[PDB]
Design a protein around this ligand. Structure first.
Ligand SMILES: [Mg+2]
Ligand SMILES: [Mg+2]
Ligand SMILES: [Mg+2]
Ligand SMILES: [Mg+2]
Ligand SMILES: [Mg+2]
Length: 112
RNA sequence: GGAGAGGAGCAGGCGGUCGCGGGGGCGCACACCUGCGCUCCCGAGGAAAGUCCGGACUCUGGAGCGGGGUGCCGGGUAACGCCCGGGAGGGGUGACCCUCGGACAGGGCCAUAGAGAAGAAGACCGCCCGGGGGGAAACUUCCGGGCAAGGGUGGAACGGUGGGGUAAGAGCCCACCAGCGUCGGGGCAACCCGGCGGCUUGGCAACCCCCACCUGGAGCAAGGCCAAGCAGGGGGUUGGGUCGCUCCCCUAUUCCCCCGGGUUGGCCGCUUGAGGUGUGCGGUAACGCACACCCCAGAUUGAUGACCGCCACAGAAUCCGGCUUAUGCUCCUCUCCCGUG
RNA sequence: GGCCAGGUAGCUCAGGGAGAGCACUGGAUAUGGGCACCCCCUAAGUCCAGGUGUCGGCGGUUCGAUUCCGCCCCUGGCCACCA
């Protein structure tokens, strides 16, 4: 859903500068009110996370978590998900349910 | 069965619940442009990779030189540094694998060790001949002369080993070998086979080079179009005109260089191509030709996931031809070895 | 996606027969200290002695490669339109 996909080239700077942030050991989540009746997701994966296979797997998991849980995630925010060094350190050791739990714990705390 | 060499295919599938990307069809709104909404088709790789080569395709005004690349020979191809076939040299018992022009066109470099390393250089331990001297003799000692044959030194010592010939010795002569010069035969050829013959005189060209062939430079962030928006200023014996050098077609600010500020939107390029698959024919083969069938990702923060159930390596970003590296199996050949019918 | 650089003692940096600087380990000795000297402890410093490496890895050429010729690994940078 590309209507659900927020542009990063223009908006990342604005969200970084004007928005809020939440984090845990695996993710940093940046967010800002978008003035819409729905939320939009963006993913920023640092080059150092790895090659296409690895980065694309992470992005797919994140997109899926967001899509399936859209109903419970707060509405009216532009959201940027950033994986942390730790995650890229035990990514192969971290299962899907753990990534889901850790990401949702942050997403559900987006206020207000 | 064991050990090993060559090579070909696949990339966990099929049946279920949801979620994407591009086309098509439809539901509709269309006073234009176009704007949404919901089923059929297709949807990452053998390496998509590293960016090591070769193109195709774009933009830079001409030519020459320099520079760079390839290196036995013959084909194949759009082309190549690739592939196929064949010839020498080497390794392995063997199937097989690895190597590749020229050092009497020239210049330069060979440390250390060693008597001596490019004109034929050299006498260290030594070998033999002719005298003077000492000494009973063995042996020593001085002068003159003859050796590259033994040993030592090396990565290599100016042909190798065996015999004859020598005072003692050398292709001095002879044998087989290696090299070179020729004559004759067979190959398009690289080169092979046989005969004759003085006796022959380092290595490195992944150092410059010589010979033969090939070659501008950038790269899809190439380049073309539209929309949006701020803010211009300082320079040019001229400089710049897609690497350098030298001759040459220009252009004078509108061009180029430096500093500063505006976008950091959308469309084209963007996928049908030296393109796959199935035969038939030619060719030792790589591969070519002929007909038929197919349309096989075109994203732009970048599309393939999760749960269930019987059994790796890693993700297109302009696209092809190859190389190299990373990696899980399965099958087909051939070689050697132990054991049996 | 493409185009370039660089990898050298622990760190910064030189350059076809492996070096400087910071630096580390010792010995010397207080004008520091147990008290005030004797005796002894500790070295910020100052003397001196050195300690030391797959040349980023793996192969080839060569008698020998930091230098030459190939691949692989790691660390950085550059590109688009407007005027
Ligand atoms: Mg059996
Ligand atoms: Mg690539
Ligand atoms: Mg890459
Ligand atoms: Mg000799
Ligand atoms: Mg440009």
């Amino acid at each position: 859903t590309r209507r659900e996909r927020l542009r990063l080239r223009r908006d990342f700077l604005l969200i970084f500068k004007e928005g809020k942030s939440l984090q845990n050991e695996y993710f940093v989540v940046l967010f800002r009110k978008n003035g819409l009746d729905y939320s939009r997701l963006g993913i920023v994966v640092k080059r150092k996370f790895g090659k296409a296979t690895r980065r694309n797997k992470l992005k797919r998991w994140v997109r899926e978590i967001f899509r399936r849980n859209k109903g419970v995630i707060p509405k009216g925010f532009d959201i940027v998900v950033i994986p942390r060094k730790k995650l890229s350190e035990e990514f192969e050791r971290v299962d899907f349910w753990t990534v889901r739990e850790k990401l949702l714990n942050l997403l559900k705390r987006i206020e207000g």
